[PDB]
Amino acid sequence: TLKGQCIAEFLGTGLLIFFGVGCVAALKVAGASFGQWEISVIWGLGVAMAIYLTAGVSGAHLNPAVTIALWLFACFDKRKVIPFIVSQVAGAFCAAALVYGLYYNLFFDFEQTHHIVRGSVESVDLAGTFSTYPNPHINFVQAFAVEMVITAILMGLILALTDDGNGVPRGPLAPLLIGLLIAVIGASMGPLTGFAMNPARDFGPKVFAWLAGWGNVAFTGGRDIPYFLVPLFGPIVGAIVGAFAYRKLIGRHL
Amino acid sequence: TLKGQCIAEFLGTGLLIFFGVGCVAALKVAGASFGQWEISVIWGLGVAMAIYLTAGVSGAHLNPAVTIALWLFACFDKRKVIPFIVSQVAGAFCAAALVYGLYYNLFFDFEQTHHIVRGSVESVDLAGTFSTYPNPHINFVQAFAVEMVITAILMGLILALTDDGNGVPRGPLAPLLIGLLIAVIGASMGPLTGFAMNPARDFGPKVFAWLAGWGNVAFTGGRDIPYFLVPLFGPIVGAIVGAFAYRKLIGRHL
Amino acid sequence: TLKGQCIAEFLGTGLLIFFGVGCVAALKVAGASFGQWEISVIWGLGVAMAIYLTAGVSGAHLNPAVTIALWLFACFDKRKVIPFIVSQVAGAFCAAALVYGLYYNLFFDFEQTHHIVRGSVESVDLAGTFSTYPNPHINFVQAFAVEMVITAILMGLILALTDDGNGVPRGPLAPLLIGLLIAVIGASMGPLTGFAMNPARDFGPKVFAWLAGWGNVAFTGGRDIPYFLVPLFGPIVGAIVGAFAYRKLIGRHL
Amino acid sequence: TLKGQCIAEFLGTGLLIFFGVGCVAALKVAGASFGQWEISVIWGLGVAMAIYLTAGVSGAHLNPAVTIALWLFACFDKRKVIPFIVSQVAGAFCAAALVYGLYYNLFFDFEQTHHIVRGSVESVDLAGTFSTYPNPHINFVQAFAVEMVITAILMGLILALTDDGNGVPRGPLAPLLIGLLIAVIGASMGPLTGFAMNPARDFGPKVFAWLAGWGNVAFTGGRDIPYFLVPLFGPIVGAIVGAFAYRKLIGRHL
Ligand SMILES: CCCCCCCCO[C@@H]1O[C@H](CO)[C@@H](O)[C@H](O)[C@H]1O
Ligand SMILES: CCCCCCCCO[C@@H]1O[C@H](CO)[C@@H](O)[C@H](O)[C@H]1O
Ligand SMILES: CCCCCCCCO[C@@H]1O[C@H](CO)[C@@H](O)[C@H](O)[C@H]1O
Ligand SMILES: CCCCCCCCO[C@@H]1O[C@H](CO)[C@@H](O)[C@H](O)[C@H]1O
Ligand SMILES: CCCCCCCCO[C@@H]1O[C@H](CO)[C@@H](O)[C@H](O)[C@H]1O
Numbered sequence A, B, C, D: 001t002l003k004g005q006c007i008a009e010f011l012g013t014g015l016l017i018f019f020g021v022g023c024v025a026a027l028k029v030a031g032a033s034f035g036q037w038e039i040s041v042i043w044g045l046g047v048a049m050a051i052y053l054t055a056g057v058s059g060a061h062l063n064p065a066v067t068i069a070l071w072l073f074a075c076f077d078k079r080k081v082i083p084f085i086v087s088q089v090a091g092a093f094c095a096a097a098l099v100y101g102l103y104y105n106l107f108f109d110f111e112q113t114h115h116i117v118r119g120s121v122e123s124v125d126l127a128g129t130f131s132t133y134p135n136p137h138i139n140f141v142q143a144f145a146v147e148m149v150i151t152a153i154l155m156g157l158i159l160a161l162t163d164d165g166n167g168v169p170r171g172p173l174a175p176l177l178i179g180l181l182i183a184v185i186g187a188s189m190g191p192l193t194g195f196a197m198n199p200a201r202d203f204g205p206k207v208f209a210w211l212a213g214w215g216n217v218a219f220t221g222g223r224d225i226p227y228f229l230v231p232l233f234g235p236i237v238g239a240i241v242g243a244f245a246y247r248k249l250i251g252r253h254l
């Protein structure tokens, strides 16, 4: 039932963001010690749990880029395309809100302690608690390239791991392995754009931050070209390229 | 045999606290390097081991909140409800005592080194070695909300992971995955209330600390409203809400 | 064939020490960043690998305390008892030697840099690279208690994990889980005595350190009562107590 | 089809280097916090993913030393030997290039910030981002010994883990376990030579660094004897010794 699938996608994506934005809020406003690998592994395992919870129902896309790619390469009913995306983005929105609710006091106290004007350019750092932003040394096109390449690897490997005709089937290991993949991607490329590779994961929370007092910098990141466009279309282009790559270079030889 | 189940629950919950309070004592009074994720993963894996050890006998509840929820939603014999809880809380008590025994010298030396009067408000930090306390910036109601939300996610996901009708069965992976779930919960929400989500895990050791010279602050946390009430009823309310949520939003669509 | 089993035990125990003493040498004389959990997880996974390699042949005891316990409670041929132990201790000896060989230069340079006289009381720290020593604040009897309690938990849980009549069988997961158990034990109790819980793991390398210029302090640890006696008999007493505990409190109710 | 196998090997080895060189670039020029175990576990899991992706096709050698050893001890068609190696080294080359592309700006900014002349002896540190180099305190022969011993353990354990006649078969766990093995090897021996143990993994990226402005020091490491020769032939000699060791000391007794 399509209604039960949209619900799962809503809970899955939200669950996913709950852990991700949560551990990052603890790092930013709670003074918790986290390394590049810790933040990555937590994001990865969060997604792994999000999958185990919703896989049996919606198939656990929990990613607009993934939904679109499966539609164009995995025979995924297009009628279910938009419903999924609207659910995925909605869950990411609510999750970010919920995480903000539990960390409410820590955000305000932190900003007062370090004289941070929420909404200003200098506040983009705490805004990074919800969505991704470009590294200081790279630009729009560079950031678009990174998100594209990584999402391709994500989609490409997801298919490989889920492809039962590829080596010994992983069975119940697939979800966990997909989480570890996300872990290593965020540890090797994270410093560049925050390994968004999920339109819903970035736009949803971004919209929340925008409402939560961060204003326009939540979308722009304090740059000339509105940054939100990168985590929005970058993952999509990559998810397709990656999906195509697997089918040709690997699938065709199985 | 109910007697053999209460024993398992006693050993399981104790084993669980042994690792948890143990790694936290090493962090607090042993000067060991631990990050928010390390402490969380150790707690998670400790519970994972506690499950593998007692699952085959008592079903491995090792959590009053869980026992009650299974009673109201998993057809768990109510006659076994109180016996379990009394065993779970007892094990947590003994474990905390045992951990204190092995770390005896380190506690006293630490307090002398940093002029800490055990029992005073400033000693709540070392008291945190046994039970959970609220973050400085949040209050009673806020702390109750956090514990409630997380325990709901705990119960909700536990059912999902153990639900054989939900995607590929995890089999022997279930326990480990439940531990990783606890890991990501403590890393994303830990800084707020110490992710207690287990009445026995918090009250048992709390009672020990109270006897061990920490006095009343072990229960109050140095606040107006006795804090021990949050980790006591907060998890219970959440465990039910979570259990209900899974049955409706997910189970009903499987 | 008993000869092929002693070889496996020799390679297993050695492999085990290779990773353990290796990561600890990198921490002590290589300036590598390791936390209490990292060192523990590396020791745990090293043992996990040591098991996968020798389990199919010798049964992978890789621990004198374990061999003795299996003899008294798992119907392990006593004729194979001494042969195993002599092999296990021999492997630990060679491994420690090999690790010292690869880290040769780093040890001498470190000692010169920090004016450390190998063999003196202050050199026990680098001697800790091979075997375990008591925490500054605890004494002989305290250290004996710690090693005893933990080894009991080790043996107790090993049986539980390997007991196919206890919940869902772990199959190929058993070894890994036994490694994670060792990981959480070393993270919760490590700071006290270095979680030796393996006579061969401590005595073998200790004898090497003694020959490598560390002298008598390698055995005494710079204390009144020769410390080597704790990691020697402490684990044995615990391995038995633990083995007994499982059979009674858990096995008898399966 | 040999063409489809060379492609897999090209993608596998590249994928492998993508994560490895990637996380190390984040550590060196992105200021990311990584410990000796984190870098090791990321390298290990990267290889684990590289295997799951290509195992079903090429058998996932992803290592010249491994290919040669399987040829001499696993009945691996020699006709496929060179094709594999040329593919493996090519993938490592491209991967290193790709990683450099995404981190382009960070490298130049870092060098300017810390006045580092790319190509000079002091630039070997950033060159370490792509290939391995010897620890300051050890020499050519010492470095050759280390790489040899570890690669032997790698090959030896790989066979053990993949040997279905050795204890309970690991099935879909094999790849992950091989990654964890690489993890513990890099954490115990890493500080000595960067646990290359893969001719393609070191030479490929080394050639890239050489073209990328690092010049001759990329091959020499700033030493008398050209260092690149160690990660080139060291792993090969060890891979054979290790392969032989397993067949004799373990295989012969199964
Ligand atoms: C789930 C529905 C959530 C709707 C958005 C709630 C956002 C609450 O966020 C609030 O936004 C205000 C407006 O900028 C700010 O002034 C406050 O500081 C901020 O707390
Ligand atoms: C499913 C996601 C669809 C996204 C469509 C584009 C939404 C763009 O969002 C817009 O960005 C502008 C630029 O900063 C802001 O000025 C506007 O307030 C904001 O609404
Ligand atoms: C398993 C049974 C344990 C019973 C409780 C033992 C507590 C020992 O704890 C002791 O408590 C004393 C009283 O406050 C303090 O004065 C001591 O400092 C403290 O070590
Ligand atoms: C199963 C757990 C039941 C718990 C029932 C409530 C126990 C409350 O405990 C009480 O808290 C008071 C307030 O700090 C203290 O003054 C008392 O000494 C203490 O006994
Ligand atoms: C595998 C067989 C190994 C035998 C022991 C070799 C120990 C080498 O160790 C050496 O011991 C000497 C004697 O104290 C010291 O003077 C040297 O500094 C030390 O390197």
Ligand SMILES: CCCCCCCCO[C@@H]1O[C@H](CO)[C@@H](O)[C@H](O)[C@H]1O
Pocket (backbone or CB within 6 Å): C203, C216, C219, C220, C226
């Ligand atoms: C299988 C292990 C058997 C160990 C038997 C006891 C070995 C004790 O070892 C002895 O310890 C003494 C005290 O420091 C030293 O003076 C001696 O040199 C040393 O040989």
Ligand SMILES: CCCCCCCCO[C@@H]1O[C@H](CO)[C@@H](O)[C@H](O)[C@H]1O
Pocket (backbone or CB within 6 Å): D094, D097, D211, D212, D213, D214
């Ligand atoms: C995939 C094909 C890649 C071919 C090699 C590209 C190397 C680009 O690297 C460039 O090399 C130049 C020459 O040293 C340097 O001057 C530049 O600083 C460096 O960016």
Ligand SMILES: CCCCCCCCO[C@@H]1O[C@H](CO)[C@@H](O)[C@H](O)[C@H]1O
Pocket (backbone or CB within 6 Å): D203, D216, D219, D220, D226
């Ligand atoms: C498959 C790998 C084959 C490697 C063959 C040896 C390549 C050596 O490479 C050479 O090293 C010299 C010494 O620094 C440099 O001067 C040369 O520029 C370089 O081409």
